[PDB]
Amino acid sequence: MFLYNLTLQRATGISFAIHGNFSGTKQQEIVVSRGKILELLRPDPNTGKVHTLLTVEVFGVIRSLMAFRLTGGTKDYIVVGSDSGRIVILEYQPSKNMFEKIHQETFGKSGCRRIVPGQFLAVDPKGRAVMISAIEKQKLVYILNRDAAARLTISSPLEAHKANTLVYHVVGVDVGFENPMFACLEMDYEEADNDPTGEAAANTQQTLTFYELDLGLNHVVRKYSEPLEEHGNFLITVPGGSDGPSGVLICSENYITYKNFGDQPDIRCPIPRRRNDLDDPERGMIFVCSATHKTKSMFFFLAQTEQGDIFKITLETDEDMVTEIRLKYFDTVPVAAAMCVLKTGFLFVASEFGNHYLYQIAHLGDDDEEPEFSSAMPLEEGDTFFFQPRPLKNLVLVDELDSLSPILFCQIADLANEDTPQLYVACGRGPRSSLRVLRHGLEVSEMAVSELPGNPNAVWTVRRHIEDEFDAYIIVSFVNATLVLSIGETVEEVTDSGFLGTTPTLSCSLLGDDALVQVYPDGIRHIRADKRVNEWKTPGKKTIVKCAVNQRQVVIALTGGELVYFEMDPSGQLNEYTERKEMSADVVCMSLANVPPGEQRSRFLAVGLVDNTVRIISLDPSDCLQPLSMQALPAQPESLCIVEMFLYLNIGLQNGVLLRTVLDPVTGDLSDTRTRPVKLFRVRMQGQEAVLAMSSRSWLSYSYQSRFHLTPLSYETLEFASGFASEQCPEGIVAISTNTLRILALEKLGAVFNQVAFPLQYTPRKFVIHPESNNLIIIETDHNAYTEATKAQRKQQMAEEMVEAAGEDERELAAEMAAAFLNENLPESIFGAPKAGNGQWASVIRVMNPIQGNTLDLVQLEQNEAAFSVAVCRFSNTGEDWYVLVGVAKDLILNPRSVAGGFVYTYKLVNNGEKLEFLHKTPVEEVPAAIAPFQGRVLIGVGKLLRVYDLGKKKLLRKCENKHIANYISGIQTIGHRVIVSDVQESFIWVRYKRNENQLIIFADDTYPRWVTTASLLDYDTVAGADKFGNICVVRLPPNTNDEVDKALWDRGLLNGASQKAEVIMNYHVGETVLSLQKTTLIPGGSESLVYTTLSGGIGILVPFTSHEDHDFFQHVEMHLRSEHPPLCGRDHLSFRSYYFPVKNVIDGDLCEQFNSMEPNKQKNVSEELDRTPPEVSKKLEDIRTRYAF
Amino acid sequence: IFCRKQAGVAIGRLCEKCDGKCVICDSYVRPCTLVRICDECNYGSYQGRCVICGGPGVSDAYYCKECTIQEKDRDGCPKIV
Amino acid sequence: SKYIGTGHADTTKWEWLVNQHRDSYCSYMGHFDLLNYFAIAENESKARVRFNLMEKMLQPCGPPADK
Amino acid sequence: LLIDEDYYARVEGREIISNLAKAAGLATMISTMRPDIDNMDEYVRNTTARAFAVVASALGIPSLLPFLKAVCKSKKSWQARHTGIKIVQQIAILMGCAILPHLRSLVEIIEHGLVDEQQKVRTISALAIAALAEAATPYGIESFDSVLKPLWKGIRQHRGKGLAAFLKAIGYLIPLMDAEYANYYTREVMLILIREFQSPDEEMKKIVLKVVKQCCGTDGVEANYIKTEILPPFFKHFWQHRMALDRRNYRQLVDTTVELANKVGAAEIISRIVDDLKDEAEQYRKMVMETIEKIMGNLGAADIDHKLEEQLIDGILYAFQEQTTEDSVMLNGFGTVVNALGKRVKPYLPQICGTVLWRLNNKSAKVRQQAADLISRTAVVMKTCQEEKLMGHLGVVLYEYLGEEYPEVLGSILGALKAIVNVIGMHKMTPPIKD
Ligand SMILES: [Zn+2]
Ligand SMILES: [Zn+2]
Ligand SMILES: [Zn+2]
């Protein structure tokens, strides 16, 4: 069994974000790290949107990311610290649209190691030197300079090592043009290692360390070291030199301290807490991210707290030293992994989970009524600052970026009655969590929809002017009628200006800038913008059958191949040429090539009959009425078209198959893609010419990264379509379904998956699908949280506490502010969940409809109750009722693990999958973490106990139990009699259950400790599964294993387990942790494949190989792309896929799909050893993606 | 016997007697990654000298394919002292 | 021998597991998806998780034993 | 130690001095080094200037800036001003692109020296401007605004080595400018440059050649201007047999001419010298052949028409035939020209192989080795030109020369045989493989 890995959608969560002039122009761009994918994004200053310029899979964990600019330069390079052990300096080339490895300096071993640097990264603000650093012991400084050729020169690494020292955060110091200084937060753990009393850990204070680097002396000196009053998390570089004072801003627990040496005392300002906060008073606020803004005159800092409140920090100096720190509340955004303030007042809030946002900075917050907190005002050192969090005043939301991070559960199912199944994915964390339905295809937004009597068969969008993109009178005709509508500011069904009129027209095309030739079955008239209806008589009495009309040529073919051709005369008279020779049969498809205004005529013309035979000739007058190349297709070509750019001729057959060939005088490389007959038409999507095919399943041959992708559209199944333009739709499609005209427009360019999101309240752990009503039974469990009843009662308790904590005269103001606090409700998804408590939880159960967004039922659990498993099942003792069993841990504290018990709620799922009624609740001793139906009974994993339960009257009856499971059951699978149990640390355990004697007999296991998140079943012997570290393994029982095994003292296993062992037949490191696997088929008519979804927001697939020769070819392709195209971070691809366990029986197609993005000389250099052309290698690479799921 | 300092930008060299040999494991099969050496081992009169004998260097020193597979190229300057 | 975390025939259980825990914490802070998992389990920001793991780096297994 | 020929000796001297400066402080360095500012001996002043530059590298340029401000404007002696400007020049030379944040300050400090009454101060000021410009390449042109009018005026008055230093400064300033000002300025200086083209003193000729190489390599100086204004006097005055007898002038003119062809077009430069391929002076032939080699290796032969092709063929044939020394430059040149022509050398290949066979029958074996090397270099193009019978005859003669006693020539003959077998094939090979 050999597989092949593909990525349908890449990872969308953002770890790091930096801003700078990476393209070298004046506009600023964002570089974001999606984990193992580096992306370059362009925030548009006009429309406010975000365009992803580049995605590169670097095949390694990007542990740090920071950009630097040299002195006097106008371009920004990207410094990447990774798990490769190498520091990589990259430059964006906008001409080739790729990242060039400018520098790759090797210093340590590969992996996220404790002392090999890569985790922490600092730059000098003048770009003179960078410092890479590990968590422990090891800091390296690279001095960066330029030669005379304006290139980049990196020095040898200067060791600034210090053994037995932890690094919290490193950053450069804006000292100006002096010696470059690096600021570190350090901990000295050596005193606490040799102290058994534990007093040293209580007194090991942090040190702010200033490492100076003397460039002339070429060494790193520990210039300054100071103790800190509390442990800080990170540092902000104050812009210094002539721009302002130097020094650092230490962010810490409930305090921010400006610190600088010399005659500067440290200035301490408390972090302001929310006024009447609903969190516990024992907690403290730390800044999660910061974004300095070096303006022309005055700088400021945007520091976001843990709740999500942005604070604007300024420093009142009145000298080179700083006298005051002034914080001020800015706004409230979701919690950001990184914030990037931009020029022209933008702010890219890259949220740590869920969708990212881009806001526009409207105001600064200076001449307003909000109070500004200062460090110079007196305090009693017992009361902090209180601010009232109001909604967005200084920020205007202009864009969002849809991110699937984190995917917590997934299911592939055709719940909507369509042909292809959908991806039902539980996303998000906490109040921003949701459930997203993902469908294949680009999103289509309607502009104007109208209803017309009579089913159309031939409609067109015709404009009276070539320059005017809007159709002046679109001929929306039918087979017998013609409901042509003129479109100006609005569409009105008027057909006075058309030559057809009330007569039906089978074709209406623009033959000139001010003239259009309409070939109705009455005749062909080249009617101009005026009433110049010259109804030219066709050769013979036959009507119009086939039309090949371009902007400079027109061919009308009757029955028998009466190819009446006409070129572009300068006068504009409807005339038919004398070259009208009858062919063997009429052309089912007739098309011409591109006819731009620069060219006098087209270069090609194709006519294909309904007897499965096509011909393509030149459209010039030298090759008129004489074919040049032939095509013996197995099916009759229903339509044909030519799309410019690398032009291609696409012919759609009578079935749902479109063959695309390269533009040539002869037949090119024919690639067939599956897609009612294919009535293909042309359109102008984003300026680029593309083809749209209407069939039983629609298709739109878009060009994303110059790739021919036949992605469908999320719209109504139209019978015909044409390109159109309007005010609401500047580049859209005017289409006709069964008696319904519509205008449809698309927004996203690539759009491999379109998502619709239904919001939730807590973090969704798992959901199951009811097989009868087709609904989703979601469990949402959140740590550190309050249930709504407990949150309301805690708000009431806080109001009752503050009205007596006032305790003086004139309490009307206190009562009215308590009422104003009680009645309001800040949104949890915007202002954060104001919830706290280490032992506290909040869990709900939600039966929800997957089609719409309605929640059918919502059962709110208790305070310290936490749902962790859910299943739906029938029973043998009970009838056809569907029972929902929910496993709940009671008062579970995660660190350290101390569970107070457990419960299993049972519900009868009344009102046909739309309501849960609480029937009973069976208490158990451990967490019932895995619930699975089993042969009419149910299997519950209570800690390390595997219990076969049957449904009783008032409780659940434990009918069988096994306790040879090692640590903790996290998942139970079931096929036939065999039960596959996942341990939290050990591998899958096979249990043979006999219905006789009621015994759960363990008979097999696998010999690897795998922190299995989830499992899946392939057949009776093979089990797939994932890892908590980002791996996917597939294990299989060997043949002729005796499953009928049955004292226990004498009999022993092979190695502390069963006597039979399961062999591993696949292992592959994804790099992003997989939480859902499913053996499904995404497109109908394809073949089954193993789909996995990852916590970073990515969806991938594994495809079995159907032949030895395909496996050998893709093995050789992967071997060549490992060497001739190394990954961008310097990580070895083979060692990255062999991270925790070695790669086995898979071929990574994420590297093999970089063959198309590799340089063409390198492409033919790779492909010459395969004895195939690079088009043939790209055809095989696309064939393995299209013959399986996309 | 190995220097094992932090290597820098200097490229290790081999003499005519050991041209093509892997400095770690002595194998002549499949060179892979260019050898980098510390700055002290390339300072002054030591520049361009053989990383095994200190004699004149005529070719670039390489780690073999087996050494780079086992990440023996990430252990520091392999100049023999 | 100079690499922190390696051991010898006189390595104690406490030092070995302290090395294991520190290696594991640094690995969590390196592997983005591990820290993502941990930040989904509790209801804390990634920065808070990083802070907690860094505070745990001082004595991840508690004070050592005598002799 | 700071003037020793060994580079590492100078690095260690600068490191020791910088450590001394950072241990003792700026105050004692200025107090210590001031009495030697106006010393009569030039080498003590040069040593102090280098020492002050390294001290500036140690403590930072702004720390030493006021001392330079005071010294460069000293009313008491021109020696102090000369030493300060030399300090600025050595700061530039030592720190390279690191001087850019204080480049404006240094230029403002030294710019007054250009109109000083003493000639040496003007010369050292121009040289310091040239060093600062070279170190700042390709940035920092704005910081030179205030220096633009003095130098440009100075070259309309000064002559000799002072004019040479001013023009060198100008030549280093031009590639930092944008297209419009580069065009304007190089049009302003081309008259003085072309006037200095015929100067007898060699250092001036080297400097002006370097300056023309710099200015022709700058964006904004159009190819037609170089064609009409620069190229005729350049080729008329510089390409003479006298300059070919010195190595530095040889190399510099070759690189300058190649950069010129790089900008104005390959054929435009090549057509002006092909006939000199047939000069009787063998050293001149070698110079022109090397020039053609470098030009054609960068750009190819796609720009060469038929007439210039025949001119090239005749020139390389004459140069190869009238050869008395075993020049590797003639071998590589013949090989690269034929291999660059590709299938276009097809009509000329009979006489060419005749000449190779001629050199293959030379009495001295080193000429034979060169001929065999040429065979190996040109076998591929001779194959794609389809002349397999002459190649077979060449294989027969080399096989007849296989009893050669001298090993390097025999090795070259074997390499030529490998080339002949690779191009003709094993079935049609003459002699048979079995022999
Ligand atoms: Zn060394
Ligand atoms: Zn050696
Ligand atoms: Zn080796």
mmCIF file with all atom_site columns, C-alpha atoms in Angstrom, chain A residues 71-74 145-150 177-179 212 214-217 219, chain D residues 15 18-19 22 57-59 62 95 97-98 100-102 134 136-139:
data_model
loop_
_atom_site.group_PDB
_atom_site.id
_atom_site.type_symbol
_atom_site.label_atom_id
_atom_site.label_alt_id
_atom_site.label_comp_id
_atom_site.label_asym_id
_atom_site.label_entity_id
_atom_site.label_seq_id
_atom_site.pdbx_PDB_ins_code
_atom_site.Cartn_x
_atom_site.Cartn_y
_atom_site.Cartn_z
_atom_site.occupancy
_atom_site.B_iso_or_equiv
_atom_site.pdbx_formal_charge
_atom_site.auth_seq_id
_atom_site.auth_comp_id
_atom_site.auth_asym_id
_atom_site.auth_atom_id
_atom_site.pdbx_PDB_model_num
ATOM 1  C CA . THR A 1 71  ? 21.096 51.912 6.084  1.00 0.00 ? 71  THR A CA 1
ATOM 2  C CA . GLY A 1 72  ? 20.123 53.886 2.995  1.00 0.00 ? 72  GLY A CA 1
ATOM 3  C CA . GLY A 1 73  ? 18.422 50.921 1.351  1.00 0.00 ? 73  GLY A CA 1
ATOM 4  C CA . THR A 1 74  ? 14.865 50.849 0.050  1.00 0.00 ? 74  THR A CA 1
ATOM 5  C CA . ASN A 1 145 ? 26.750 44.740 5.547  1.00 0.00 ? 145 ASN A CA 1
ATOM 6  C CA . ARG A 1 146 ? 26.905 45.491 1.825  1.00 0.00 ? 146 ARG A CA 1
ATOM 7  C CA . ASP A 1 147 ? 29.547 45.216 -0.851 1.00 0.00 ? 147 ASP A CA 1
ATOM 8  C CA . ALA A 1 148 ? 29.926 47.723 -3.689 1.00 0.00 ? 148 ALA A CA 1
ATOM 9  C CA . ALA A 1 149 ? 27.428 45.742 -5.806 1.00 0.00 ? 149 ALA A CA 1
ATOM 10 C CA . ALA A 1 150 ? 24.570 46.528 -3.336 1.00 0.00 ? 150 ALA A CA 1
ATOM 11 C CA . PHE A 1 177 ? 24.416 55.120 14.992 1.00 0.00 ? 177 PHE A CA 1
ATOM 12 C CA . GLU A 1 178 ? 26.415 53.854 17.985 1.00 0.00 ? 178 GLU A CA 1
ATOM 13 C CA . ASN A 1 179 ? 27.377 50.246 18.688 1.00 0.00 ? 179 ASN A CA 1
ATOM 14 C CA . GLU A 1 212 ? 26.670 45.603 23.254 1.00 0.00 ? 212 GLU A CA 1
ATOM 15 C CA . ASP A 1 214 ? 31.489 46.616 19.055 1.00 0.00 ? 214 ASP A CA 1
ATOM 16 C CA . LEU A 1 215 ? 31.655 46.433 15.264 1.00 0.00 ? 215 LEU A CA 1
ATOM 17 C CA . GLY A 1 216 ? 35.278 47.540 14.997 1.00 0.00 ? 216 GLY A CA 1
ATOM 18 C CA . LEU A 1 217 ? 36.392 45.322 17.872 1.00 0.00 ? 217 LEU A CA 1
ATOM 19 C CA . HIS A 1 219 ? 33.037 40.891 19.676 1.00 0.00 ? 219 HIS A CA 1
ATOM 20 C CA . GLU D 2 15  ? 42.797 45.995 16.291 1.00 0.00 ? 15  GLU D CA 1
ATOM 21 C CA . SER D 2 18  ? 41.388 50.388 18.538 1.00 0.00 ? 18  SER D CA 1
ATOM 22 C CA . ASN D 2 19  ? 41.665 48.423 21.795 1.00 0.00 ? 19  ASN D CA 1
ATOM 23 C CA . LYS D 2 22  ? 38.786 52.158 23.843 1.00 0.00 ? 22  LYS D CA 1
ATOM 24 C CA . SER D 2 57  ? 36.186 53.218 13.939 1.00 0.00 ? 57  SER D CA 1
ATOM 25 C CA . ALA D 2 58  ? 36.641 52.265 17.600 1.00 0.00 ? 58  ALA D CA 1
ATOM 26 C CA . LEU D 2 59  ? 34.872 55.148 19.361 1.00 0.00 ? 59  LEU D CA 1
ATOM 27 C CA . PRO D 2 62  ? 30.566 61.504 15.977 1.00 0.00 ? 62  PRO D CA 1
ATOM 28 C CA . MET D 2 95  ? 34.804 51.617 7.130  1.00 0.00 ? 95  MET D CA 1
ATOM 29 C CA . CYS D 2 97  ? 29.380 51.515 3.702  1.00 0.00 ? 97  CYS D CA 1
ATOM 30 C CA . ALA D 2 98  ? 29.376 52.082 7.498  1.00 0.00 ? 98  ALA D CA 1
ATOM 31 C CA . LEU D 2 100 ? 26.873 56.460 5.372  1.00 0.00 ? 100 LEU D CA 1
ATOM 32 C CA . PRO D 2 101 ? 25.053 57.880 8.487  1.00 0.00 ? 101 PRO D CA 1
ATOM 33 C CA . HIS D 2 102 ? 27.775 60.532 8.932  1.00 0.00 ? 102 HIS D CA 1
ATOM 34 C CA . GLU D 2 134 ? 33.478 54.782 -3.271 1.00 0.00 ? 134 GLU D CA 1
ATOM 35 C CA . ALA D 2 136 ? 29.008 55.019 -0.108 1.00 0.00 ? 136 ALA D CA 1
ATOM 36 C CA . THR D 2 137 ? 28.351 53.222 -3.430 1.00 0.00 ? 137 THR D CA 1
ATOM 37 C CA . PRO D 2 138 ? 25.606 53.100 -4.555 1.00 0.00 ? 138 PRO D CA 1
ATOM 38 C CA . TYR D 2 139 ? 23.914 55.363 -1.969 1.00 0.00 ? 139 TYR D CA 1
#
